[PDB]
Amino acid sequence: TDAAEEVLLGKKGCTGVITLNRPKFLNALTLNMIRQIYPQLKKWEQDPETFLIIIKGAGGKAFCAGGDIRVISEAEKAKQKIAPVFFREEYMLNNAVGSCQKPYVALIHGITMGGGVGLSVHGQFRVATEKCLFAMPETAIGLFPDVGGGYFLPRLQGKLGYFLALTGFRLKGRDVYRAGIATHFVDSEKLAMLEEDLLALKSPSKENIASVLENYHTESKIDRDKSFILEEHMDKINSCFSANTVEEIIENLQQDGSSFALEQLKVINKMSPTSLKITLRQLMEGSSKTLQEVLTMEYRLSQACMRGHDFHEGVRAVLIDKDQSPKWKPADLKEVTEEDLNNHFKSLGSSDLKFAENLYFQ
Numbered sequence: 001t002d003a004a005e006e007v008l009l010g011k012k013g014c015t016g017v018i019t020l021n022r023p024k025f026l027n028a029l030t031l032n033m034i035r036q037i038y039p040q041l042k043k044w045e046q047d048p049e050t051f052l053i054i055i056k057g058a059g060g061k062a063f064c065a066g067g068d069i070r071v072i073s074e075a076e077k078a079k080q081k082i083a084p085v086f087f088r089e090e091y092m093l094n095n096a097v098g099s100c101q102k103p104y105v106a107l108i109h110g111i112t113m114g115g116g117v118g119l120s121v122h123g124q125f126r127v128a129t130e131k132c133l134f135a136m137p138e139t140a141i142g143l144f145p146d147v148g149g150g151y152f153l154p155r156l157q158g159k160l161g162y163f164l165a166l167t168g169f170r171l172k173g174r175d176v177y178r179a180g181i182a183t184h185f186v187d188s189e190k191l192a193m194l195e196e197d198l199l200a201l202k203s204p205s206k207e208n209i210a211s212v213l214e215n216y217h218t219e220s221k222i223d224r225d226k227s228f229i230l231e232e233h234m235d236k237i238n239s240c241f242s243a244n245t246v247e248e249i250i251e252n253l254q255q256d257g258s259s260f261a262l263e264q265l266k267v268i269n270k271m272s273p274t275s276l277k278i279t280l281r282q283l284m285e286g287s288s289k290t291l292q293e294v295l296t297m298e299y300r301l302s303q304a305c306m307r308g309h310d311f312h313e314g315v316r317a318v319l320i321d322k323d324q325s326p327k328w329k330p331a332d333l334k335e336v337t338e339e340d341l342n343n344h345f346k347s348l349g350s351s352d353l354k355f356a357e358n359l360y361f362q
């Protein structure tokens, strides 16, 4: 047996199967994996013998915990940078998933966060199990909810996505479905059969695929009639998170004064202030952008963030030392100025992320 690849690509029946394959690192997405997945997705779109693409994670704990931001941060320490290529090609793959010309099913069993969400939420079908653990945890690490977070987050109900984006709130299991992040829910004990039945389909249409998913979804039992964990908080979320500045959101939470609001206020106050301001503007702007436009914006954001202090500090606090004790700079929201913010959003000119060759554009 040769050494295992970081992602497996296979053809089984009518289906192309992508298996994220770094389970010891929670299947975190690398440039190597992106560069295998992206061209394969494009080939399968044009392959008349491929009717379905499934993405899944190896190991049963994680679908994918994120893009591999540890390695990106390490690479920032010296001259062999990875960030310019990584974010560009990652975002190109999120767009490819979102515009996929064949049915695309993501089996989001297990931890599904950040980059892992980018590989799933934009696809046509996302199947959660009771073990699905969703978050966009980027404001805790000095980044922002990228991989198209600026597109999908504002499009969740009310201001749910703004709440998720700013606080990194975790949703588990059937709540991932209730939130609209998963399209379907299956108990994990039946996931293997669901996979098998999809793979066994002969020349399936999108409708054939949808039928299989529906049939499993209907019969799943775990939390079947449980309400969405955030339903009782949706009015206050919709109110508090309607403001145009982070300072106003924090003020609204304080004035609401409920246990939940004060808990989430506490969390927000531990997030990178720069990250918070970026994230709010990103979602507000993203609310009126296409996925491509959003990704173009996020690419600018990603490169600006590499030039700041907080990303490297967040990776240290969260991923390396795990002391959950980041010292942000600036430490106060007041010191995140309008000009600083505007600088992150500036065009990169000919270095911008674009989705066609130059001759396509005026």
Ligand SMILES: O=c1c(O)c(-c2ccc(O)c(O)c2)oc2cc(O)cc(O)c12
Pocket: 024, 025, 026, 027, 028, 065, 066, 067, 068, 069, 070, 114, 115, 137, 138, 140, 141, 143, 318, 319
């Ligand atoms: O992007 C992220 C990421 O990749 C991982 C991660 C953690 C453990 C692993 O073993 C791994 O491979 C990845 O954690 C995170 C935690 C955050 O709060 C925010 C993030 O953005 C990430």
